[PDB]
mmCIF file of C-alpha atoms and ligand atoms in Angstrom:
data_model
loop_
_atom_site.group_PDB
_atom_site.id
_atom_site.type_symbol
_atom_site.label_atom_id
_atom_site.label_comp_id
_atom_site.label_asym_id
_atom_site.label_seq_id
_atom_site.Cartn_x
_atom_site.Cartn_y
_atom_site.Cartn_z
ATOM 1 C CA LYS A 1 24.846 58.492 42.608
ATOM 2 C CA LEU A 2 28.626 58.847 42.289
ATOM 3 C CA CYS A 3 29.767 61.585 44.693
ATOM 4 C CA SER A 4 26.382 61.458 46.428
ATOM 5 C CA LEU A 5 26.891 57.784 47.241
ATOM 6 C CA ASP A 6 29.125 57.734 50.324
ATOM 7 C CA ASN A 7 31.366 60.489 48.945
ATOM 8 C CA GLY A 8 32.329 58.264 46.024
ATOM 9 C CA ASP A 9 34.397 56.181 48.475
ATOM 10 C CA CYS A 10 36.877 59.093 48.539
ATOM 11 C CA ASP A 11 38.843 59.894 51.703
ATOM 12 C CA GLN A 12 38.458 63.618 51.086
ATOM 13 C CA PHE A 13 37.458 65.681 48.041
ATOM 14 C CA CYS A 14 35.111 64.134 45.478
ATOM 15 C CA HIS A 15 34.384 65.540 42.003
ATOM 16 C CA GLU A 16 32.330 64.144 39.135
ATOM 17 C CA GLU A 17 34.056 64.245 35.751
ATOM 18 C CA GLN A 18 32.533 62.622 32.668
ATOM 19 C CA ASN A 19 29.911 60.891 34.813
ATOM 20 C CA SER A 20 32.646 59.305 36.934
ATOM 21 C CA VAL A 21 34.128 59.862 40.405
ATOM 22 C CA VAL A 22 37.475 61.633 40.763
ATOM 23 C CA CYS A 23 39.019 61.837 44.250
ATOM 24 C CA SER A 24 41.531 64.412 45.478
ATOM 25 C CA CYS A 25 43.247 65.557 48.681
ATOM 26 C CA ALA A 26 44.095 68.629 50.741
ATOM 27 C CA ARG A 27 47.606 70.074 50.636
ATOM 28 C CA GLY A 28 50.090 67.894 52.486
ATOM 29 C CA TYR A 29 48.362 64.722 51.298
ATOM 30 C CA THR A 30 49.009 62.631 48.205
ATOM 31 C CA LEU A 31 46.348 60.537 46.478
ATOM 32 C CA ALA A 32 46.953 56.834 47.060
ATOM 33 C CA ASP A 33 47.471 54.303 44.275
ATOM 34 C CA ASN A 34 43.807 53.281 44.510
ATOM 35 C CA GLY A 35 42.771 56.811 43.594
ATOM 36 C CA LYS A 36 40.635 57.126 46.731
ATOM 37 C CA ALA A 37 42.696 57.267 49.932
ATOM 38 C CA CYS A 38 44.743 60.284 50.976
ATOM 39 C CA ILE A 39 48.235 59.662 52.360
ATOM 40 C CA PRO A 40 50.090 62.187 54.593
ATOM 41 C CA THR A 41 53.451 63.435 53.290
ATOM 42 C CA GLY A 42 54.886 64.098 56.734
ATOM 43 C CA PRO A 43 54.148 64.289 60.459
ATOM 44 C CA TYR A 44 51.303 66.555 61.555
ATOM 45 C CA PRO A 45 49.297 66.552 58.302
ATOM 46 C CA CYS A 46 46.470 69.057 58.372
ATOM 47 C CA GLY A 47 43.233 68.081 60.052
ATOM 48 C CA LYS A 48 44.563 65.275 62.254
ATOM 49 C CA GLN A 49 44.300 65.315 66.038
ATOM 50 C CA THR A 50 47.521 64.527 67.897
ATOM 51 C CA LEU A 51 46.373 61.791 70.288
ATOM 52 C CA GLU A 52 49.178 59.215 70.125
ATOM 53 C CA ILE B 1 32.501 78.428 75.371
ATOM 54 C CA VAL B 2 29.392 77.954 77.517
ATOM 55 C CA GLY B 3 28.989 74.279 78.328
ATOM 56 C CA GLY B 4 30.911 71.774 76.239
ATOM 57 C CA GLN B 5 34.060 69.998 77.409
ATOM 58 C CA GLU B 6 37.752 70.723 77.899
ATOM 59 C CA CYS B 7 39.952 70.090 74.901
ATOM 60 C CA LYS B 8 42.018 67.143 76.092
ATOM 61 C CA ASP B 9 45.640 66.567 75.072
ATOM 62 C CA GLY B 10 45.870 66.651 71.274
ATOM 63 C CA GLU B 11 42.168 67.188 70.567
ATOM 64 C CA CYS B 12 42.244 70.781 69.269
ATOM 65 C CA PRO B 13 45.755 71.296 67.877
ATOM 66 C CA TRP B 14 44.721 73.973 65.338
ATOM 67 C CA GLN B 15 43.554 76.440 67.988
ATOM 68 C CA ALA B 16 45.470 79.711 68.122
ATOM 69 C CA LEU B 17 45.171 82.441 70.752
ATOM 70 C CA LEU B 18 45.665 86.137 69.990
ATOM 71 C CA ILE B 19 47.331 87.824 72.952
ATOM 72 C CA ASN B 20 47.709 91.528 73.708
ATOM 73 C CA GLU B 21 50.543 93.486 75.337
ATOM 74 C CA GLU B 22 49.432 92.147 78.726
ATOM 75 C CA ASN B 23 49.958 88.612 77.407
ATOM 76 C CA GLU B 24 46.240 87.889 77.804
ATOM 77 C CA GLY B 25 44.154 86.187 75.136
ATOM 78 C CA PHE B 26 41.338 88.228 73.622
ATOM 79 C CA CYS B 27 40.400 86.227 70.520
ATOM 80 C CA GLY B 28 40.980 82.901 68.821
ATOM 81 C CA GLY B 29 42.433 81.899 65.493
ATOM 82 C CA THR B 30 42.899 78.742 63.422
ATOM 83 C CA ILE B 31 46.316 77.521 62.273
ATOM 84 C CA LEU B 32 46.282 77.114 58.476
ATOM 85 C CA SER B 33 49.977 76.435 57.836
ATOM 86 C CA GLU B 34 53.340 77.081 59.461
ATOM 87 C CA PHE B 35 53.148 80.775 58.488
ATOM 88 C CA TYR B 36 49.424 81.602 58.475
ATOM 89 C CA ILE B 37 46.592 82.101 60.977
ATOM 90 C CA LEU B 38 42.906 82.578 60.132
ATOM 91 C CA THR B 39 40.881 84.898 62.375
ATOM 92 C CA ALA B 40 38.060 87.478 62.459
ATOM 93 C CA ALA B 41 38.531 91.003 61.112
ATOM 94 C CA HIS B 42 36.648 92.520 64.052
ATOM 95 C CA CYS B 43 39.275 91.091 66.410
ATOM 96 C CA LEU B 44 41.883 93.399 64.891
ATOM 97 C CA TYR B 45 40.226 96.359 66.619
ATOM 98 C CA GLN B 46 40.644 94.715 70.028
ATOM 99 C CA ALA B 47 44.384 95.283 70.450
ATOM 100 C CA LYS B 48 46.934 97.792 69.165
ATOM 101 C CA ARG B 49 49.836 95.337 69.072
ATOM 102 C CA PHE B 50 49.268 91.606 69.520
ATOM 103 C CA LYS B 51 51.033 88.268 69.097
ATOM 104 C CA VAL B 52 49.854 84.704 68.491
ATOM 105 C CA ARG B 53 50.218 81.803 70.912
ATOM 106 C CA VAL B 54 49.924 78.181 69.762
ATOM 107 C CA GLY B 55 49.931 74.906 71.669
ATOM 108 C CA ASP B 56 48.304 76.276 74.818
ATOM 109 C CA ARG B 57 45.447 74.555 76.648
ATOM 110 C CA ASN B 58 45.905 76.139 80.075
ATOM 111 C CA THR B 59 46.843 79.815 80.367
ATOM 112 C CA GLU B 60 47.608 79.478 84.078
ATOM 113 C CA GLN B 61 51.001 77.834 83.569
ATOM 114 C CA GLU B 62 53.626 77.015 80.955
ATOM 115 C CA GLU B 63 53.875 73.358 79.940
ATOM 116 C CA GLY B 64 56.754 73.747 77.512
ATOM 117 C CA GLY B 65 54.580 73.035 74.500
ATOM 118 C CA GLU B 66 53.381 76.613 74.071
ATOM 119 C CA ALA B 67 55.010 78.954 71.553
ATOM 120 C CA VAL B 68 54.535 82.666 70.850
ATOM 121 C CA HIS B 69 54.799 84.140 67.362
ATOM 122 C CA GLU B 70 54.997 87.739 66.211
ATOM 123 C CA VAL B 71 52.817 88.887 63.331
ATOM 124 C CA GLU B 72 54.617 90.158 60.234
ATOM 125 C CA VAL B 73 51.627 91.046 58.062
ATOM 126 C CA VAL B 74 47.971 91.625 58.898
ATOM 127 C CA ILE B 75 45.597 91.041 55.997
ATOM 128 C CA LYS B 76 42.114 92.302 56.869
ATOM 129 C CA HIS B 77 39.246 92.031 54.390
ATOM 130 C CA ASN B 78 38.748 95.527 52.987
ATOM 131 C CA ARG B 79 34.966 95.136 53.062
ATOM 132 C CA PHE B 80 34.591 94.425 56.773
ATOM 133 C CA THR B 81 32.551 96.988 58.677
ATOM 134 C CA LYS B 82 31.117 97.010 62.195
ATOM 135 C CA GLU B 83 27.881 98.339 60.707
ATOM 136 C CA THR B 84 26.997 94.924 59.269
ATOM 137 C CA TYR B 85 29.780 92.654 60.543
ATOM 138 C CA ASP B 86 29.854 91.315 56.994
ATOM 139 C CA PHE B 87 33.181 90.047 55.621
ATOM 140 C CA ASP B 88 34.433 89.276 59.134
ATOM 141 C CA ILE B 89 37.715 87.629 58.156
ATOM 142 C CA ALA B 90 41.447 88.278 58.352
ATOM 143 C CA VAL B 91 44.639 86.338 57.702
ATOM 144 C CA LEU B 92 47.867 86.842 59.640
ATOM 145 C CA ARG B 93 51.314 85.993 58.303
ATOM 146 C CA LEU B 94 53.760 85.212 61.103
ATOM 147 C CA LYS B 95 57.382 86.377 61.276
ATOM 148 C CA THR B 96 58.616 82.862 62.075
ATOM 149 C CA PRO B 97 57.193 79.418 61.169
ATOM 150 C CA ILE B 98 55.136 77.408 63.659
ATOM 151 C CA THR B 99 56.689 74.147 64.878
ATOM 152 C CA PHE B 100 54.103 71.383 64.651
ATOM 153 C CA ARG B 101 53.983 68.955 67.575
ATOM 154 C CA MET B 102 51.497 67.478 70.028
ATOM 155 C CA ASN B 103 48.759 70.121 70.338
ATOM 156 C CA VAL B 104 50.057 72.150 67.384
ATOM 157 C CA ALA B 105 48.883 71.296 63.877
ATOM 158 C CA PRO B 106 47.002 72.983 61.018
ATOM 159 C CA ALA B 107 43.349 72.395 60.147
ATOM 160 C CA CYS B 108 42.579 71.513 56.519
ATOM 161 C CA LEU B 109 41.207 74.038 54.049
ATOM 162 C CA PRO B 110 38.433 72.393 52.013
ATOM 163 C CA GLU B 111 37.478 72.879 48.390
ATOM 164 C CA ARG B 112 34.421 75.091 47.953
ATOM 165 C CA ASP B 113 31.884 72.885 46.183
ATOM 166 C CA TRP B 114 32.755 69.761 48.174
ATOM 167 C CA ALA B 115 32.715 71.625 51.481
ATOM 168 C CA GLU B 116 29.285 73.100 50.783
ATOM 169 C CA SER B 117 27.819 69.814 49.535
ATOM 170 C CA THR B 118 29.473 67.430 51.986
ATOM 171 C CA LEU B 119 30.787 69.207 55.091
ATOM 172 C CA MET B 120 28.153 71.857 55.678
ATOM 173 C CA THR B 121 25.366 69.318 55.155
ATOM 174 C CA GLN B 122 26.546 67.148 58.035
ATOM 175 C CA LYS B 123 24.689 67.181 61.333
ATOM 176 C CA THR B 124 27.323 68.950 63.422
ATOM 177 C CA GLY B 125 30.604 70.810 63.612
ATOM 178 C CA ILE B 126 32.921 71.723 66.497
ATOM 179 C CA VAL B 127 33.687 75.179 67.877
ATOM 180 C CA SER B 128 36.507 75.832 70.344
ATOM 181 C CA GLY B 129 38.125 78.623 72.309
ATOM 182 C CA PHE B 130 39.195 80.310 75.537
ATOM 183 C CA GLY B 131 36.130 82.564 75.557
ATOM 184 C CA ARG B 132 33.781 83.256 78.451
ATOM 185 C CA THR B 133 32.056 80.225 79.973
ATOM 186 C CA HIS B 134 28.969 82.219 80.942
ATOM 187 C CA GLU B 135 27.475 85.232 79.165
ATOM 188 C CA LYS B 136 28.653 87.314 82.100
ATOM 189 C CA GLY B 137 32.167 86.367 83.154
ATOM 190 C CA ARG B 138 35.897 86.350 82.445
ATOM 191 C CA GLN B 139 37.834 84.505 79.746
ATOM 192 C CA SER B 140 38.475 80.791 80.284
ATOM 193 C CA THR B 141 41.946 79.698 81.360
ATOM 194 C CA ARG B 142 41.199 76.323 79.776
ATOM 195 C CA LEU B 143 40.634 75.602 76.101
ATOM 196 C CA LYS B 144 37.121 74.230 75.564
ATOM 197 C CA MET B 145 35.234 72.715 72.649
ATOM 198 C CA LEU B 146 31.574 72.137 71.851
ATOM 199 C CA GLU B 147 29.725 70.082 69.258
ATOM 200 C CA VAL B 148 27.160 72.344 67.579
ATOM 201 C CA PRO B 149 24.461 71.334 65.065
ATOM 202 C CA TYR B 150 24.359 73.122 61.732
ATOM 203 C CA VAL B 151 21.208 75.226 61.604
ATOM 204 C CA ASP B 152 18.835 75.538 58.652
ATOM 205 C CA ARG B 153 19.445 78.820 56.837
ATOM 206 C CA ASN B 154 15.766 79.771 57.073
ATOM 207 C CA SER B 155 15.590 79.078 60.807
ATOM 208 C CA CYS B 156 18.877 80.959 61.081
ATOM 209 C CA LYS B 157 17.461 84.148 59.566
ATOM 210 C CA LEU B 158 14.199 84.007 61.520
ATOM 211 C CA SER B 159 16.068 83.688 64.820
ATOM 212 C CA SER B 160 18.259 86.729 64.217
ATOM 213 C CA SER B 161 17.465 90.353 65.017
ATOM 214 C CA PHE B 162 20.170 91.267 62.507
ATOM 215 C CA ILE B 163 20.712 90.534 58.822
ATOM 216 C CA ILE B 164 22.446 87.211 58.156
ATOM 217 C CA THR B 165 24.413 87.673 54.927
ATOM 218 C CA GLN B 166 25.544 84.987 52.491
ATOM 219 C CA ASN B 167 28.982 85.221 54.109
ATOM 220 C CA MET B 168 27.540 83.944 57.419
ATOM 221 C CA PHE B 169 26.004 80.756 58.818
ATOM 222 C CA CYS B 170 24.330 79.596 62.073
ATOM 223 C CA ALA B 171 25.200 76.714 64.379
ATOM 224 C CA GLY B 172 23.993 75.829 67.862
ATOM 225 C CA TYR B 173 20.968 74.702 69.862
ATOM 226 C CA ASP B 174 17.418 76.032 70.120
ATOM 227 C CA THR B 175 16.819 75.033 73.748
ATOM 228 C CA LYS B 176 20.026 73.533 75.150
ATOM 229 C CA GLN B 177 22.071 76.361 76.620
ATOM 230 C CA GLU B 178 25.567 75.681 75.320
ATOM 231 C CA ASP B 179 27.310 77.786 72.642
ATOM 232 C CA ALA B 180 30.310 80.029 71.941
ATOM 233 C CA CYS B 181 30.741 83.391 73.684
ATOM 234 C CA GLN B 182 32.772 86.611 73.763
ATOM 235 C CA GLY B 183 36.454 85.838 73.379
ATOM 236 C CA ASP B 184 35.818 82.785 71.195
ATOM 237 C CA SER B 185 35.629 85.215 68.241
ATOM 238 C CA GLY B 186 38.117 84.513 65.467
ATOM 239 C CA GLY B 187 38.528 80.898 66.524
ATOM 240 C CA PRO B 188 37.856 77.609 64.681
ATOM 241 C CA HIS B 189 34.629 76.063 63.603
ATOM 242 C CA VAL B 190 35.719 72.718 62.149
ATOM 243 C CA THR B 191 33.831 69.819 60.600
ATOM 244 C CA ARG B 192 34.980 66.206 60.847
ATOM 245 C CA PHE B 193 34.919 63.944 57.810
ATOM 246 C CA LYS B 194 36.462 60.462 58.106
ATOM 247 C CA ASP B 195 38.656 61.512 61.057
ATOM 248 C CA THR B 196 39.990 64.574 59.234
ATOM 249 C CA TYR B 197 39.008 68.039 60.433
ATOM 250 C CA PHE B 198 38.390 70.855 57.942
ATOM 251 C CA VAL B 199 37.981 74.498 58.916
ATOM 252 C CA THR B 200 34.455 75.563 57.966
ATOM 253 C CA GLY B 201 33.836 78.671 60.029
ATOM 254 C CA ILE B 202 35.295 81.577 61.965
ATOM 255 C CA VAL B 203 33.507 82.526 65.189
ATOM 256 C CA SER B 204 32.021 85.941 64.368
ATOM 257 C CA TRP B 205 29.151 87.095 66.603
ATOM 258 C CA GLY B 206 26.022 86.223 68.550
ATOM 259 C CA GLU B 207 23.165 87.823 70.466
ATOM 260 C CA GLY B 208 24.328 87.050 73.970
ATOM 261 C CA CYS B 209 25.575 83.515 74.567
ATOM 262 C CA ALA B 210 23.741 80.183 74.631
ATOM 263 C CA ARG B 211 20.431 82.055 74.594
ATOM 264 C CA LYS B 212 17.385 79.946 73.765
ATOM 265 C CA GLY B 213 16.161 80.666 70.252
ATOM 266 C CA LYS B 214 19.522 82.148 69.262
ATOM 267 C CA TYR B 215 22.647 80.712 67.628
ATOM 268 C CA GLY B 216 26.325 81.380 67.086
ATOM 269 C CA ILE B 217 27.064 83.218 63.843
ATOM 270 C CA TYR B 218 30.150 82.198 61.857
ATOM 271 C CA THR B 219 31.951 83.583 58.836
ATOM 272 C CA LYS B 220 31.516 80.999 56.086
ATOM 273 C CA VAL B 221 35.021 79.922 55.094
ATOM 274 C CA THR B 222 33.845 78.545 51.734
ATOM 275 C CA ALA B 223 32.827 82.089 50.741
ATOM 276 C CA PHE B 224 36.446 83.217 51.049
ATOM 277 C CA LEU B 225 38.643 80.355 49.853
ATOM 278 C CA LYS B 226 39.973 82.368 46.890
ATOM 279 C CA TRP B 227 40.565 85.409 49.101
ATOM 280 C CA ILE B 228 42.345 83.185 51.642
ATOM 281 C CA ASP B 229 44.497 81.577 48.952
ATOM 282 C CA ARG B 230 45.512 85.004 47.626
ATOM 283 C CA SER B 231 46.334 86.255 51.123
ATOM 284 C CA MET B 232 48.515 83.210 51.810
ATOM 285 C CA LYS B 233 50.772 84.198 48.917
ATOM 286 C CA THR B 234 50.856 87.964 49.463
HETATM 287 O O1 FFG C 301 28.961 89.137 69.332
HETATM 288 C C1 FFG C 301 28.403 89.659 70.299
HETATM 289 C C2 FFG C 301 28.630 89.209 71.606
HETATM 290 C C3 FFG C 301 28.269 89.885 72.764
HETATM 291 C C4 FFG C 301 28.634 89.074 73.863
HETATM 292 C C5 FFG C 301 28.370 89.325 75.312
HETATM 293 F F1 FFG C 301 27.146 88.871 75.551
HETATM 294 F F2 FFG C 301 29.217 88.604 76.013
HETATM 295 F F3 FFG C 301 28.498 90.603 75.548
HETATM 296 N N1 FFG C 301 29.202 87.968 73.383
HETATM 297 N N2 FFG C 301 29.196 88.042 72.022
HETATM 298 C C6 FFG C 301 29.631 87.017 71.234
HETATM 299 C C7 FFG C 301 30.867 86.989 70.471
HETATM 300 C C8 FFG C 301 31.223 85.831 69.654
HETATM 301 C C9 FFG C 301 30.334 84.683 69.600
HETATM 302 C C10 FFG C 301 29.088 84.728 70.380
HETATM 303 C C11 FFG C 301 28.131 83.616 70.408
HETATM 304 N N3 FFG C 301 28.259 82.449 69.773
HETATM 305 N N4 FFG C 301 27.261 81.757 70.072
HETATM 306 C C12 FFG C 301 26.445 82.422 70.919
HETATM 307 O O2 FFG C 301 25.408 82.002 71.434
HETATM 308 N N5 FFG C 301 26.970 83.618 71.107
HETATM 309 C C13 FFG C 301 28.747 85.884 71.185
HETATM 310 C C14 FFG C 301 27.620 91.248 72.654
HETATM 311 C C15 FFG C 301 26.836 91.271 71.339
HETATM 312 N N6 FFG C 301 27.520 90.682 70.157
HETATM 313 C C16 FFG C 301 27.229 91.165 68.911
HETATM 314 C C17 FFG C 301 28.276 91.677 68.025
HETATM 315 C C18 FFG C 301 27.903 92.164 66.707
HETATM 316 C C19 FFG C 301 26.496 92.136 66.286
HETATM 317 C C20 FFG C 301 26.124 92.636 64.903
HETATM 318 C C21 FFG C 301 25.480 91.720 63.948
HETATM 319 C C22 FFG C 301 25.107 92.196 62.624
HETATM 320 C C23 FFG C 301 25.339 93.560 62.174
HETATM 321 C C24 FFG C 301 25.972 94.474 63.097
HETATM 322 C C25 FFG C 301 26.356 94.005 64.440
HETATM 323 C C26 FFG C 301 27.029 95.036 65.343
HETATM 324 N N7 FFG C 301 26.159 96.159 65.722
HETATM 325 C C27 FFG C 301 26.776 97.175 66.616
HETATM 326 C C28 FFG C 301 25.564 97.420 67.484
HETATM 327 C C29 FFG C 301 24.746 96.147 67.656
HETATM 328 O O3 FFG C 301 23.398 96.443 68.043
HETATM 329 C C30 FFG C 301 24.786 95.790 66.170
HETATM 330 C C31 FFG C 301 25.456 91.619 67.191
HETATM 331 C C32 FFG C 301 25.822 91.132 68.504
#
């Protein structure tokens, strides 16, 4: 199932390489140590509402 | 936008408004980065000289959060034509960088394969703008948004009196009379995934507004990601 199973548990982009899940992020985000979450590099990262 | 709800504080920070010499908005755009705005090519015929306003939700007054930017470069797709409305896309480079703040932030550009497999297969996206709130009427002074279902490509083509190209997609309702309208053109269609909003469409055209059996037609952003990337460097 990989990418087709809940987006491979990725926060954002999911790719399948060698029958395994590889996660990645939009510009302005860095891939977390767990290889799944995407962490903003500054305030106002793309795609986030400004509600607080 | 016909129907829908107001964009409340911070809800639609990637909305841009193209304004003419009279300082009135005539089309939308989507903020892509501090220097770049995404919009529709057909909007470029709507004003000789125009600027871009960001951070506005109410055109009636200044709040202090609004900012106006001059356009340095207009990059219109060379294949756009009003004969087909195909390739309805343009990128604007601004003379000065946008300051991000409450109500001003970029939307994310997705990757092509993932966007098509994961974003465009979701139930709904969100369209927003200052366009007319009834098919006959003036532009809205308030920024509005509307959740719109993605529409099956087959049902899309059968509903349209005009050719839907591979650069276009449909969203909206069959019976419920809410949809985008004139003036929303060029603005954002975004799709939420895990609380992050990716730009998936550009409001392009429609047969009337919120008509039963008709839908909003959007330029498919995934069809132009390489063209967008090239424009954001040139
Ligand atoms: O785009 C509009 C339009 C109009 C009005 C208003 F009704 F306000 F006038 N609003 N509006 C608009 C704008 C933005 C969003 C929505 C919207 N979103 N969702 C929803 O429901 N509506 C509605 C008027 C008609 N039009 C239009 C423009 C272009 C083509 C088109 C399509 C293919 C090839 C070629 C052409 C162009 N050619 C030239 C002659 C024509 O015959 C064919 C068809 C219709």
